């Protein structure tokens, strides 16, 4: 008997698997013939009946356990199992199935009955599903600012029979052209799309602001959608949620096929708590109509609300300062790691996103040659001479920098030995011919830089920069990867070495991870990792640099500001106390001989340490800067966070 028990639990399992992933028919075509006491439908009825029922309940990944297979008559196994499935209003669990196999000449079918669809089914019973769909959470501000809500838009649209016949068709058209900002030749084409018929309402575009005048055929409907009230100022960070697909229903189910997905940011993110839980019923009825069994049921949860360490404020300031340029602004406040504001630039549309975008648009942002989708705050960077401060520390830490001890540097270049050929560190004024750190640091002298890490060393570089985060992941619901020093565990090279000292190198850090490690200044040596979440509890990290290192440079980073030829000393117009850290790298991109370069600024408060901002611009245009743009911001932090 083994041997056909055996069968069985072959036949059961293949079963359980064809209707698992979703292949019907190769389950139906393992039943019995059609009869009674072997099974109750004909194998396209089977099928049929499998891909209504599992179909309108999006059934997903059917899993059975504790299968046991016995024997009845002399052709007749009895089969029982329990079993779990998904659906579109969540798991089923704890099913106790139950049937007869058949077995006639060498194999072994399956005596099918409408109770291997769900357990209590039996004859022609039906089964009904209800839903209702959840609400989208919000995403807030610090204050409770809205950045992604659920507003009530007023959508534009025309009617083509209302617009006329040939001349006055014709004269509608431009005047709804011209009155909503739009063109000619995109109305036609979008009332002569195949879908649409001459009374049906053809929607144009969604009007942010008071409705002016309608034309004839023109009409101002609202309908509900998601909202981005700072826009392309927080398109980066926020993302934007899009139509959900066929597709997106197939990987989860327990999505509403009428909702919206994030797909990109924090909408992406925090999909899962933001779009709440779907309400509704899964019930067997009867011939008609009547319940005879609730398989699932429970109430619609609206999503929950994610609140944000951003400042709306802030973060349009910082975004604003940027001009529209490649570039980005992380802002602080570092003794507690909040995220004031995460800016990247250029920028997209969300509104348009979410709300219907051409694809002539949309190709314009994926072929902008400065790629307004880039989170550039997430995105690893070489950090730029700025990295001085660090290579300091380092070197006062361990006790190769003497603060008052002076290098002699003469002229703009430098390099240790001919090995070098035609590298050489280079710096911007032959002025100073004596250069201690402070003067390195007032002046961004790279050469100085780079004689103290070769002389240093890179075991003692290195133990420095292992004490900061390189390697880590940081805790943050953004997509980044982990800074590094270098892309093996050895430099193998003294030029690296030397470029890495000065923030060059293959260094990459991105803006996030930049702002953590220089949050030492702030918090007399101790790392504080940024924070996101509002509600989130403060991490740090002791001991990075030392509590000496920190009081020697902060005073330096004072004169970058105060001294008259200091590098950020356009910002002491403003008045208030700085410490700041300039810098640049230079970059060489395939398809331009001459080298790009970037453009960084590092500012905060050294009386009160409310605040912190790294800001870079990339691939500058010539008599930019990071500096020249940050004195708006400079005074919001200050004036808000002390």
């Known amino acids: 008997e083994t041997q056909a028990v055996e069968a069985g639990e072959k036949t059961v399992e293949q079963f359980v698997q064809a209707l698992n992933k979703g292949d019907y028919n190769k389950a139906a075509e393992m039943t019995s013939k059609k009869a009674a006491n072997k099974s109750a439908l004909s194998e396209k009825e089977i099928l049929d009946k499998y891909q209504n029922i599992y179909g309108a309940a999006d059934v997903k990944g059917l899993q059975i356990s504790n299968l046991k297979v016995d024997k009845k008559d002399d052709s007749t196994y009895s089969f029982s199992y329990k079993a779990k499935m998904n659906t579109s209003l969540g798991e089923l669990k704890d099913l106790s199935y139950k049937g007869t196999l058949d077995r006639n000449d060498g194999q072994t079918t399956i005596n099918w009955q409408p109770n291997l669809v769900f357990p209590e089914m039996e004859g022609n019973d039906k089964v009904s599903l209800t839903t209702q769909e959840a609400a989208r959470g919000n995403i807030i501000d610090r204050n409770g600012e809205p950045l992604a809500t659920t507003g009530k838009l007023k959508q534009l649209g025309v009617v083509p029979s209302k617009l006329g016949d040939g001349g006055e068709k014709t004269a509608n058209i431009k005047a709804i052209a011209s009155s909503f900002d739009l063109t000619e030749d995109a109305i036609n084409q979008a009332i002569s799309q195949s879908w649409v018929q001459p009374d049906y309402f053809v929607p144009l575009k969604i009007i942010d ?115 529209g340029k490649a570039g980005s602004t992380v802002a602080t406040t570092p003794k507690t790691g909040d995220l004031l504001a995460l800016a990247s630039s250029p920028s997209y549309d969300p509104n348009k996103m979410t709300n219907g975008i051409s694809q002539e648009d949309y190709k314009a942002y994926e072929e902008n040659p400065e790629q307004p989708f880039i ?166 990290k002791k001991n990075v640099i030392g509590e000496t290192a920190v009081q020697t440079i902060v005073p330096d980073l004072r004169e970058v500001v105060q001294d008259v030829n200091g590098t950020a000393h356009s910002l002491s117009a403003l008045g208030i106390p700085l410490a700041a850290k300039t810098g640049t790298a230079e970059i060489k991109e395939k398809q331009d001989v001459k080298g790009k370069e970037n453009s960084f600024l590092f500012a905060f408060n050294p009386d009160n340490q409310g605040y912190m901002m790294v800001s870079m611009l990339e691939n500058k245009e010539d008599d930019d800067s990071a500096t020249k743009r940050a004195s708006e911001l400079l005074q919001y932090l200050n004036q808000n966070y002390q």
């Open 375 to 540: 989170s550039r705050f997430a995105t690893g960077y070489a950090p730029g001479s700025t990295f001085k401060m660090i290579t300091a520390a380092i070197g006062l830490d361990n006790g190769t920098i003497d603060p008052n001890e002076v290098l002699t540097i003469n002229g703009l270049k430098w390099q240790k030995d001919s090995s070098w050929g035609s590298y050489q560190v280079t710096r911007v004024s032959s002025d100073v011919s004596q250069v201690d750190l402070k003067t390195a640091l007032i002046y961004s002298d790279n050469i100085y830089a780079a004689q103290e890490t070769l002389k240093m060393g890179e075991k003692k570089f290195r133990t420095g920069l292992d004490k900061f985060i390189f390697g880590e992941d940081l805790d943050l619901p953004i997509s980044m990867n982990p800074a590094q020093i270098s892309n093996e565990d050895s430099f193998n090279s003294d030029i690296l070495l030397a470029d890495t000292g000065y923030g060059q190198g293959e260094l990459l850090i991105n803006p996030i991870q930049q702002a953590a490690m220089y949050s030492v200044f702030a918090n007399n040596g101790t790392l504080v990792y940024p924070k996101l979440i509002a509600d989130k509890e403060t991490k740090d």
């Open 209 to 323: 602001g008071a409705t002016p005048e309608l034309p004839a055929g023109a009409t101002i409907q609202e309908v509900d959608g998601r909202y981005y009230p700072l826009g392309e100022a927080a398109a980066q960070l926020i993302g934007y949620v899009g139509d959900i697909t066929a597709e997106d229903i197939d990987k989860n189910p327990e999505l509403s096929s009428n909702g919206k997905i994030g797909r990109s940011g924090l909408e992406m993110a925090f999909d899962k708590d933001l779009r709440g839980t779907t309400g509704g019923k899964l019930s067997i009825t009867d011939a008609d109509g009547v319940e005879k069994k609730v398989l699932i049921e429970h109430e619609v949860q609206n999503g929950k609300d994610i609140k944000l360490t951003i400042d709306a404020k802030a973060q349009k300031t910082a975004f604003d300062s940027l001009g």
